[PDB]
Design a protein around this nucleic acid. Structure first.
Lengths: 307, 100, 197, 50
RNA sequence: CUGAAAAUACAGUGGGGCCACUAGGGACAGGAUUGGUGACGUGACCUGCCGUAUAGGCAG
């Protein structure tokens, strides 16, 4: 059934997330790490904290969204290509992309993407979209997935989810958003950007003037936005980053193992079955099967999967 | 004697990813990076990230939609009309549509 | 005048050296404070650039007091259990080979907590004097030579901390004047110890 | 396996990573425009075989 | 209890003289490497003092 050269391009394109603070003179002062070297086989220890007189620190990144989850980028089999195309169209017209878009949008609003810096202070999030909208969350610390929100934050969630869903479904619409978090820093608060694997060094973004500003990898922000997978069991303790085998990085064992029928490929073998299930789900108050939500979340993640 | 100087100016997003030409590495040593980028070395000594000339050449000659009367997709001009996405030759040697 | 010494050798391969080195120095510190001793020095015979060794040696002029320190509870207990190898009180070969192990506090400035503490103090003092608090940063990255850690617990305040030990080489013997960890702190105390192997 | 059957290696090794050494190109912060320039020469070489 | 036992190859030594690889010479046309990725939270580096000082020194 499965093709030779089946591959998908990801739908969510987040940038590098730069850390900085604003003074009276300049409105972009890059947050620099303190380099210490030892000994010539020199070891480099780098530490990062908010400068003494600075009271707010900013994390900024851009997210642009293409509709690269309707048709595969490459394929050998014409019938598979036509099947997946019609499946995507069926899933779109049923209105499941809306549910995916809401989950993606909620992670942006609660500051998941601020990993170890999340809710260390009173964080507010500003979102400026390409279509001239401007959303504000006011306090990140008062939100949570399972919590019920105020009508203001729900209006922000509704509007931005509609913009992301339209961007995810329409190929002829170019959509981008500029997302800034403003965190109330304590006196010389330690900041946790992304580190290099190889000593302790931080992921830097070289400015135009030559100075290096500590940041998160795009992949890490991505991993935060796409932390929605709680379909693996009914009472799921956490939301996993979307993986083909439901791999949990913290615990370090797969929640959708290859032996099980809930891994991506086992679900991808039943597409013609799920198409008929979705076609029955059209006109019908009937909810969509969570396997299809997991399927389309992997297709929105992308892959050069089998083979 | 005709020559053109062509420049694109892209309104970039905040720390947007750029996609230049990638150098092949199947012969991989684990010391230095496997996936590299094609670079144009400047007179100052720095390396500007760049496309191959053949890459640019392949884009300009993406004009071949004559292989069917209702085909909208344009292939890169090939003697057998090779489509590497769907992975078939649109002008096979069996047919009368191949160059030869 | 003839400086005697003994040596505690840590036998297990899986032993955390910073822990055991701290325990040995803390027990010496306790003993020094109890008995009111002055001139006690600590030397690391098996000191490498990779790490401090399995060996720690205590250098003093009196033989009886070293014999008293050898006959402490922890040493004989960890020798009975079979983790320690405690040497007899031997006279130093007394040829040459003087080194100086220093507790360098400046190493502590490479960590964020120290900068936060130090700036909080400078803020209070600058505020007390009545001027505006505006400290200026350094341009050069901080240069430190190899140092090894010795884990040390304040029983007075119940606070865990670390001694940043650095080895220097000197030509000939100086006066035995040390800190209460016998550790020649590079300006106040200038006490040398014999190099053992 | 090649015909879709799970081979039994450690449950902990599936969540395990691969170390990738890549080159990355991003626009420097607060640079509004990027530029791509090439030159094109056109010759009349399709009239006569070389 | 061996195709059995046993066993001093030695002394001396001049390869030498001479020597021209040379002339001539188009490697050339065409080329899409591409899809996808969380370095760390079972950790020592703390809490203070002196000093005008992110200088430099110190106590557990």
């Amino acid at each position: 059934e499965l093709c030779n050269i089946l591959k998908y391009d990801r739908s969510l394109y987040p940038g590098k997330a730069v850390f900085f603070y604003k003074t009276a003179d300049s409105d972009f002062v890059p947050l620099e790490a303190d380099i210490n070297k030892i000994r010539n086989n020199i070891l480099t220890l780098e530490e990062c904290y908010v400068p003494p007189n600075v009271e707010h620190i900013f994390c900024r990144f851009s997210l642009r969204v293409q509709a690269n989850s309707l048709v595969p980028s490459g394929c050998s089999d014409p019938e598979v290509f036509s099947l997946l195309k019609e499946l995507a169209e069926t899933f779109k017209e049923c209105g499941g992309y809306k549910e995916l878009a809401v989950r993606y949008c909620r992670n942006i609003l609660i500051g998941t993407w601020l990993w170890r810096n999340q809710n260390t202070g009173n964080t507010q999030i500003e979102i400026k979209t390409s279509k001239g909208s401007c959303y504000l969350i006011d306090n990140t610390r008062k939100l949570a997935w399972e919590s019920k929100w105020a009508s203001d934050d729900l209006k922000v969630l509704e509007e931005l989810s509609n913009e992301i869903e339209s961007a995810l479904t329409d190929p002829n619409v170019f959509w981008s958003a500029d997302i800034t978090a403003k965190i109330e820093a304590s006196f010389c608060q330690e900041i946790y950007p992304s580190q290099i694997l190889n000593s302790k060094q931080f992921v830097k973004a070289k400015c135009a003037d030559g100075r290096y500003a500590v940041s998160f990898n795009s992949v890490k922000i991505g991993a935060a936005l796409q932390s929605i997978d709680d379909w693996w069991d009914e009472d799921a303790s956490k939301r996993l980053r979307v993986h083909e085998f439901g791999a949990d990085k913290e615990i370090g064992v797969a929640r959708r193992p290859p032996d099980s029928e809930q891994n991506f490929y086992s679900i991808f073998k039943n597409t013609e079955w799920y198409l008929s299930a979705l076609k029955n789900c059209i006109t019908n108050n009937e909810k969509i099967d969570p396997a299809i939500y997991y399927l389309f979340s992997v297709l929105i993640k992308g892959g050069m999967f089998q083979k | 004697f005709w020559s053109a100087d062509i420049t694109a100016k892209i309104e970039a997003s905040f720390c947007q990813e750029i996609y230049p030409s990638q150098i092949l590495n199947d012969k991989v040593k684990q010391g230095e990076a496997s996936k590299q980028f094609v670079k144009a070395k400047c007179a100052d000594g720095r390396y500007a990230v760049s496309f191959n000339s053949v890459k640019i050449g392949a884009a300009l000659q993406s004009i071949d939609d004559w292989w069917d009367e209702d085909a909208s997709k344009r292939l890169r001009v090939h003697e057998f009309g090779a489509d590497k996405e769907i992975g078939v030759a649109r002008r096979p040697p069996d047919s009368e549509q191949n160059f030869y | 005048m003839q400086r005697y010494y003994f040596t505690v050798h840590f036998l297990p391969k899986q032993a955390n050296l910073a822990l055991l080195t701290g325990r040995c120095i803390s027990i010496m510190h306790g003993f020094i404070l109890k008995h009111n001793i002055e001139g006690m020095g600590v030397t690391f015979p098996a000191w490498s650039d990779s790490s401090i060794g399995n060996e720690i040696a205590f250098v003093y002029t009196d033989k009886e007091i070293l014999n008293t320190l050898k006959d402490q509870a922890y040493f004989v207990d960890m020798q009975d259990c079979g983790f320690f190898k405690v040497s007899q009180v031997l006279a130093v070969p007394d040829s040459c080979e003087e080194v100086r192990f220093i507790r360098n506090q400046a190493v502590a400035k490479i960590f964020t907590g120290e900068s936060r503490r130090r700036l909080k103090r400078l803020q209070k003092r600058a505020l007390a004097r009545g001027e505006d608090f505006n400290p200026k940063k350094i341009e050069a990255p901080r240069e430190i030579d190899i140092f090894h850690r010795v884990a040390m617990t304040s029983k007075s305040s119940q606070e865990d901390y670390i001694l940043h030990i650095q080895k220097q080489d000197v030509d000939c013997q100086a006066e035995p004047y040390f800190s209460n960890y016998g550790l020649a702190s590079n300006e106040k105390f200038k006490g040398t110890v014999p190099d053992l192997s | 396996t090649p015909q879709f059957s799970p081979k039994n290696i450690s449950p902990q090794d599936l969540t395990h990573n691969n170390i990738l050494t890549l080159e990355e190109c991003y626009v420097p912060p607060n640079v509004e425009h990027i530029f791509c320039r090439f030159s094109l020469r056109v010759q009349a070489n399709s009239l006569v075989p070389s």
